[PDB]
Structure 1
Amino acid sequence: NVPHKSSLPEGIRPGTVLRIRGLVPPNASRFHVNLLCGEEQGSDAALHFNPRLDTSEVVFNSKEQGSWGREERGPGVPFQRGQPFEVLIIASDDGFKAVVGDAQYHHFRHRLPLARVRLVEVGGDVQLDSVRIF
């Protein structure tokens, strides 16, 4: 892996599916997937998906003008150190649906306009095998 970025300079529309395949390293503490509204530093985050192995939670949030919004959490932690995982982030008209493995995990309703998303960035403690956008 590596702090991985995929620019989407022309944006995305409902019906776009982000498929991330990878592995949580043995001593991982946390990793994240951000759908950002620009390439500049401090850009708003339409979505911050943050599995935290250290605190056993998975947090969802948005970032606007530098401030994080209200945190949402899914049930438990469907990730485990030393194991492979597959996540689908689906963009629909009303939000992003997150699927982990074979289960629907959480539905995050849009906070910022989907039309503003211009970049996908994956970072933290994660071994990335592939990131596809369908």
Structure 2
Amino acid sequence: HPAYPMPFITTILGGLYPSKSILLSGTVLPSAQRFHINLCSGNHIAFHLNPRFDENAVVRNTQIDNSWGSEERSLPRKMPFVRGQSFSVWILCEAHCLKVAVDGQHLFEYYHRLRNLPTINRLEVGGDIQLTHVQT
């Protein structure tokens, strides 16, 4: 299995809705600094999942136009993403929030800030990883 182009952008026909799942698998580059997964709506980023190896954190936020909201960084356990290590991310959309699991284990919830779920119809992946698979 080769690699997807990076950054990778693709439409999510129908957008989001309760029970909607988006899966991604890949490998964090050996000296990765950061990478991100965005769920977009028009010119806004409804959900920005941003693991950072330089800060050893997983940042989540929303951007309306060019205005970033308040970041959410809480984690129930140690940073699950590791440089040079393969990973899988599962994003499950519920009515009130997104539930995110990494490597098969739930990591956090993100309450919807952009609530018109069907309008969240674009996925963007960028940064320091080798993207090997996406299931929209």
State whether TM-score is above 0.5. yes
Aligned to 1:46: 46
Deviations along 1:105-127, one digit per CA (max 9) or x if unpaired, are 01000001222202000001111
| TM-score of the superposed pair, with normalisation by structure 2 | 0.90
Return the alpha-carbon distance in structure 2 between the equivalents of residues 32 and 107 of structure 1: 17
Tell me what 1:132 maps to. Answer: 135
Say whether residues 1:3 and 2:45 are aligned partners: no
Paired with 1:119 and 1:47, the residues of 2 have a C-alpha distance of: 11
Query: Matched residue pairs, number?
Result: 129
TM-score, L = length of structure 1: 0.91
Deviations 1:33-56 (A, max 9, x none): 000002xxxx11110000001110
* Equivalent residue letter for 2:132: D
CA contact (8 A) 2:14 2:118 kept: no
Alignment pair present for 1:24 and 2:25: no
Structure 1 residues without counterparts, runs of 5 or longer: none
1:13 aligns with 17
Q: Which amino acid in the other structure matches residue 95 of structure 1?
A: C
Instruction: Compute the RMSD of aligned alpha carbons.
Output: 1.1
CA deviation after TM superposition for structure 1 residue 9, in Å: 4.2
Q: How far apart in 2 are the matches of 1:45 and 1:26? A: 28
